[PDB]
Amino acid sequence: TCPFYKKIPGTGFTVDAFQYGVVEGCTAYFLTHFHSDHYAGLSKHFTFPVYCSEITGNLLKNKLHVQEQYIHPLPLDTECIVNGVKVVLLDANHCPGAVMILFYLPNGTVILHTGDFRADPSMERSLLADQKVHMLYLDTTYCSPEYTFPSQQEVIRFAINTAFEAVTLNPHALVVCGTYSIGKEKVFLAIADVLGSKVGMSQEKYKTLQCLNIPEINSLITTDMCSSLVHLLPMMQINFKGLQSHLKKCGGKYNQILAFRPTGWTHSNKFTRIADVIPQTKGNISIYGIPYSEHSSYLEMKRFVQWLKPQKIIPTVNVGTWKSRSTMEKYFREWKLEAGY
Numbered sequence: 001t002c003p004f005y006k007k008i009p010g011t012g013f014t015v016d017a018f019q020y021g022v023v024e025g026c027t028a029y030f031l032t033h034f035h036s037d038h039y040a041g042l043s044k045h046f047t048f049p050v051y052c053s054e055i056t057g058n059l060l061k062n063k064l065h066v067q068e069q070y071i072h073p074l075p076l077d078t079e080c081i082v083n084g085v086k087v088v089l090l091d092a093n094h095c096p097g098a099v100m101i102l103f104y105l106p107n108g109t110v111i112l113h114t115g116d117f118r119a120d121p122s123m124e125r126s127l128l129a130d131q132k133v134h135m136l137y138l139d140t141t142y143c144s145p146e147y148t149f150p151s152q153q154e155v156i157r158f159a160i161n162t163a164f165e166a167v168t169l170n171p172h173a174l175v176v177c178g179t180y181s182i183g184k185e186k187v188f189l190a191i192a193d194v195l196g197s198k199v200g201m202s203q204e205k206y207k208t209l210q211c212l213n214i215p216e217i218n219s220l221i222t223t224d225m226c227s228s229l230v231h232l233l234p235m236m237q238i239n240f241k242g243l244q245s246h247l248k249k250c251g252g253k254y255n256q257i258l259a260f261r262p263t264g265w266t267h268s269n270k271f272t273r274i275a276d277v278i279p280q281t282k283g284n285i286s287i288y289g290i291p292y293s294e295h296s297s298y299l300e301m302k303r304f305v306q307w308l309k310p311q312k313i314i315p316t317v318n319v320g321t322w323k324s325r326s327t328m329e330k331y332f333r334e335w336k337l338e339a340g341y
């Protein structure tokens with residue numbers, strides 16, 4: 001059954017609650033972003049209103065074939081009414097189209113649901129600064145202090161210099177980048193840009209990217225593999241066996257593959273700096289795993305919650321075990337005591 005942390009009290013709303021059939025008493029289903037765990041259950045046969053951003057909107061229409069009449073896109077940073085309730089969608093700094101939602105309840109309670117987010121100081125100067133938030137439905141993906149990672153800027157600098165260097169030394173080297181969902185486009189686009197190439201991908205993935213309202217996107221991507229030296233593949237295929245195979249496919253146009261696996265966190269973040277990262281090499285094929293996160297680090301999360309000073313916090317990630325739940329509650333109590341709310 002639909003769990004409690006997907007329900008918004010004193011409304012008939014749910015958030016990311018599409019895999020439970022008809023939820024008893026839901027008049028409107030919100031979708032925070034186009035990732036499968038979140039949209040799981042949607043299809044062309046869904047006949048209740050869905051509320052979402054314009055971009056998530058384009059992907060439901062064209063990737064899932066949901067009927068236009070049921071998609072309700074809303075602009076960001078704008079006070080809107082949905083079944084008698086004031087709401088606002090805010091940028092989540094997760095993947096394209098990803099939003100946080102503010103609900104203003106009839107009784108005067110204010111509720112922020114973060115969806116998936118990477119907390120940032122820029123959020124402290126949004127519509128959030130203008131009033132008090134009583135309840136916080138929080139992406140707690142990395143709520144533990146071991147979870148440090150570099151900024152997105154630093155990681156992009158690394159990958160750019162790595163790729164430029166390798167291709168200037170050996171002009172017959174191919175760059176390959178792994179992907180399995182939206183998000184993390186900056187990796188492959190920034191590499192393509194330093195290298196004077198467009199990115200080449202499958203038809204399904206080109207379609208996916210054509211939905212994202214990216215500026216000058218027609219100039220940055222293609223379905224013509226051959227005319228491009230930055231290729232996207234299924235993340236599954238990023239390994240020595242799957243790369244060697246793909247190397248054959250290019251027909252002696254390239255002798256070396258340099259490839260990037262944008263991970264979330266990996267235990268090597270507990271020891272090594274971004275400057276000191278190294279690849280796995282098997283002959284003419286190297287694989288870098290780079291820690292490009294679209295979720296808050298522990299410290300970014302902590303700062304945002306201590307700035308927001310909510311009265312109650314409800315987790316949406318790592319909720320399935322008592323050990324996780326108990327650990328999170330401990331950190332929430334530390335933050336509240338250190339900051340005095």
Ligand code: NI
Binds near residue numbers: 033035094116
């Ligand atoms: Ni997500």
